[PDB]
Design a protein around this nucleic acid. Structure first.
Lengths: 459, 213
DNA sequence: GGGGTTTTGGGG
């Protein structure tokens, strides 16, 4: 017996059940009450807009508050647009809005249904799920679904897809522009686009955000907590705080109850924001002119054909590639690292003469090397996962077979003679070994070694 | 820089852990609010929190000047550290949360007086200094220049991979091990070739000052 | 404390 949000009885003490679309939600957090609270903004075909007029794009909503004694009993909302199903929820009126309360320890229960083909979780794991009637996450040990609910579920999906595609669910009033960040007394929300995801260390990522205001902010996002964060995706940060004690970088501080929500494909807001917001690199080019840069600068750009390819850790690349049954199959990999030292130490020796018929390279010092001009640079790199060990890994840039020739954007030439080519490479050398400088490259495996290919510098 | 602790700890790392090299302007007494006292005694300058380290020759004074004013119940009450020091030492960041990348800047205290006319006043909910974006990068820079220095002295001769081993790779099959190169004077897996004078001052374990009282 | 602040103190 499922009731509709706007038609739910405000007086009947009898617990009510319903189906709804989640547009906002906090991350399940703990209170000293030994209770775990999870607050979300729900919407359905009867309650969605301000009720004043269409001009009030400001989405009117009902607030659902879930209570539990354990963290595992609360839902983790990664996406907005998905459907939640509550059982035994008591309705109350809190400061003008309709508030549904639920104690999942006593009698209440919930079930999360995906509005899209695959849910966020079964989308990361590359899982295939064509079972449209089964919930991807539910409160207790068992979840029952009658054939009567099917009509409600599949129709609520149609509505959700139409609601998100014709309306910008997260209206202007439910978030603050980044250029207004330092003017807020405290807590504020933000709808931005992930310009860059940087693996700071083992547990935390660093998101380079940018919204319509034009401002660029940085924020630390944990890996385990937020594993759905991807580059180029529009998200909504539930609870953020302006970091007043940050002078070199514009930083947003997140709390344990804060949440990073992404939108379902039909979203009009996320759709428009993906196109209207592009990267500027203004932050990067500026930081490069400073001795010590606190901003991460990705110096390279991978070819468009490997843009979808996943990034493998340097540790897996060197310590597990000969053991792991999956890495033995692959030959080409994508990885991110930072150059600690470049060999040969003398830039002029980076380009050498090469004999096709002999497979041996020679120096062009006395210009005695008659072979073809090729690059024979060797990078001693380090990784985020390798950060603590006493190791350095060899990544080669041997262009004899055409791999990574276009890397320096300057064609190979006798560096002892061509001054222009020498300066260009000398500039890139100090740029690569500089702190906070990273390389996003694609490598091909040959006889136990990794070669840079289909990758090039953009600075 | 509004954070007194963030400026202090950043200054120490940018000076190789030499408390002498840091400006004598920051040597002034630090009046800071106490967030916690047990299981972990965490103090805050209003923006971040740090775990100070009391001396077994400093708490004796605290009891003499302030009898029966239990230290474990100082939670939510301001303290004023008169004479303090700033050490640097290697630790296991997986067991010590008040550190990052196996490095910790410890706040050594020798004398602290409790000021009662103080209530709740942090400008915001305090966060772990060793979890902050800028500060975590300040430490990354420290280890970077130390690794880069130890690397340029250890790896010598420009030992390049013979191009023959990479040409016509088809008939050749190799083990990835070849690419691995030790970064410095190995004494284990942990890189530890640092040039800072590690802190060696015996400190009071929070458990002691609890059972003692 | 529902627009909130635990400890598991790098999901909470």
């Amino acid at each position: 017996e499922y009731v509709e949000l706007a038609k739910a009885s405000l007086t009947s003490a009898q617990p009510q059940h319903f189906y709804a679309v989640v547009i906002d939600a906090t991350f399940p957090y703990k209170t000293n009450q030994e209770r775990y609270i999870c607050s979300l903004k729900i919407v359905d075909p009867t309650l969605y807009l301000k009720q004043q007029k269409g001009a009030g794009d400001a989405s009117d909503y009902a607030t659902l508050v879930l209570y539990a004694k354990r963290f595992e009993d609360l839902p983790i909302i990664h996406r907005a647009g998905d459907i939640i199903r509550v059982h035994r929820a008591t309705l109350r009126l809190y400061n003008g809005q309709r508030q549904f309360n639920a104690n999942v320890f006593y009698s209440s229960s919930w079930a999360l249904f995906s509005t899209d083909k695959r849910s966020v979780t079964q989308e990361i794991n590359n899982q295939d799920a064509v079972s449209d009637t089964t919930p991807f996450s539910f409160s207790s040990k068992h979840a029952t679904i009658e054939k009567n609910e099917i009509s409600i579920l599949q129709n609520l999906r149609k509505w959700a897809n139409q609601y998100f595609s014709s309306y910008s669910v997260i209206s202007s009033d439910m978030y603050t522009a980044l250029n207004k960040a330092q003017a807020q007394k405290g807590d504020f929300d933000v709808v931005a686009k992930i310009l860059q995801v940087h693996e700071l260390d083992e547990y935390t990522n660093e998101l380079k955000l940018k919204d319509a205001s034009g401002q660029v902010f940085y924020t630390l996002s944990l890996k385990l907590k937020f594993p759905h964060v991807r580059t180029g995706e529009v998200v909504r940060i539930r609870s953020a705080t302006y970091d007043e004690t940050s002078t070199q970088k514009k930083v947003l501080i997140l709390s344990h109850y804060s949440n990073i929500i992404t939108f379902i494909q039909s979203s009009k807001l996320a759709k428009e924001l993906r196109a209207k917001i592009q990267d500027d690199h203004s932050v990067e080019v500026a930081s490069l002119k400073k001795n010590v840069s606190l901003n991460a600068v990705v110096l390279t750009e991978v070819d468009k054909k490997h843009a979808a390819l996943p990034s493998t850790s340097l540790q897996d690349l060197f310590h597990h590639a000969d053991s792991d049954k999956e890495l033995q199959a692959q030959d080409t990999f994508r990885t991110q690292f930072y150059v600690t030292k470049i060999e040969p130490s003398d830039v002029k020796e980076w380009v050498k003469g090469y004999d096709r018929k002999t497979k041996k390279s020679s120096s062009l010092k006395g210009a005695s090397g008659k072979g073809d001009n090729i690059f024979q640079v060797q990078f001693l790199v380090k990784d985020a996962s390798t950060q603590l060990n006493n190791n350095t890994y060899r990544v080669l840039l041997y262009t004899q077979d055409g791999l990574g020739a276009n890397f320096f954007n300057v064609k190979a030439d006798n560096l002892h003679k061509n001054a222009d080519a020498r300066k260009k490479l000398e500039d890139s050398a100090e740029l690569l070994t500089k702190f906070n400088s990273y390389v996003d490259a694609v490598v091909e495996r040959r006889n136990g070694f990794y070669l840079i290919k289909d990758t090039k510098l953009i600075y | 820089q509004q954070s007194a602790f963030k400026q202090l700890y950043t200054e120490l790392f940018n000076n190789e852990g030499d408390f002498s090299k840091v400006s004598s302007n920051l040597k002034k007494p630090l009046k800071c609010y106490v967030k916690e006292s047990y299981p972990h005694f965490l103090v805050t300058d209003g923006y971040f929190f740090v775990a100070p380290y009391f001396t077994k020759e400093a708490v004796n004074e605290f009891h003499a000047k302030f009898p029966n004013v239990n230290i474990v119940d100082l939670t939510d009450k301001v303290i004023v550290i008169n004479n303090w020091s700033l050490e640097l030492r290697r630790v296991n960041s997986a067991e010590v949360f008040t550190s990052y990348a196996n490095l910790e800047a410890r706040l050594i205290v020798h004398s602290f007086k409790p000021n009662l006319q103080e209530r709740l006043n942090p400008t915001r909910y305090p966060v772990n200094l060793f979890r902050d974006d800028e500060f975590k990068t300040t430490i990354q820079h420290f280890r970077h220049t130390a690794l880069q220095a130890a690397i340029n002295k250890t790896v010598k001769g420009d030992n390049l991979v013979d191009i023959s081993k990479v040409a016509d790779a088809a008939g050749k099959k190799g083990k990835v091990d070849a690419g691995i190169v030790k970064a410095s004077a190995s004494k284990g897996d942990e890189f530890s070739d640092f040039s800072f004078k590690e802190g060696n001052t015996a400190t009071l374990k929070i458990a002691d000052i609890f059972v003692q009282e």
